[PDB]
Amino acid sequence: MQRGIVWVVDDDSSIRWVLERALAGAGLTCTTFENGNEVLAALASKTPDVLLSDIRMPGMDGLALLKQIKQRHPMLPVIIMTAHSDLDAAVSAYQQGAFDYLPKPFDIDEAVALVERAISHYQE
Numbered sequence: 001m002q003r004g005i006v007w008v009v010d011d012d013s014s015i016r017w018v019l020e021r022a023l024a025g026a027g028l029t030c031t032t033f034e035n036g037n038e039v040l041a042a043l044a045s046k047t048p049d050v051l052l053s054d055i056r057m058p059g060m061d062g063l064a065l066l067k068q069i070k071q072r073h074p075m076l077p078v079i080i081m082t083a084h085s086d087l088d089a090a091v092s093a094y095q096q097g098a099f100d101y102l103p104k105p106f107d108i109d110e111a112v113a114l115v116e117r118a119i120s121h122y123q124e
């Protein structure tokens with residue numbers, strides 16, 4: 001049941017290949033973007049069930065990426081790979097409905113782990 005669209009924003013390629021096929025086997029649609037602002041463009045026409053954002057490119061490292069998401073999507077939850085920058089912006093995330101902040105590690109094991117158990121807690 002349910003579609004299941006998981007969007008990721010990071011270095012792509014490596015992160016994409018793993019999360020794309022592997023997460024696809026789980027029954028979801030995993031796509032990746034450059035870092036964050038890219039998903040925003042796509043977000044302007046769609047909303048993923050579990051968004052994943054990077055944090056090492058934009059102004060506020062990555063938390064800034066959250067701000068963009070909350071500006072147009074004050075509900076779409078996002079998952080950041082790092083929280084070493086201005087954590088302040090991460091707060092605007094929790095208020096808009098962000099997912100959380102995961103350490104640099106991720107891959108399928110660490111990401112799929114946080115995604116499945118997370119969506120399961122939400123349910124329809």
Ligand code: BEF
Nearest residue numbers: 054055056081082
């Ligand atoms: F690689 Be991301 F900037 F955490």
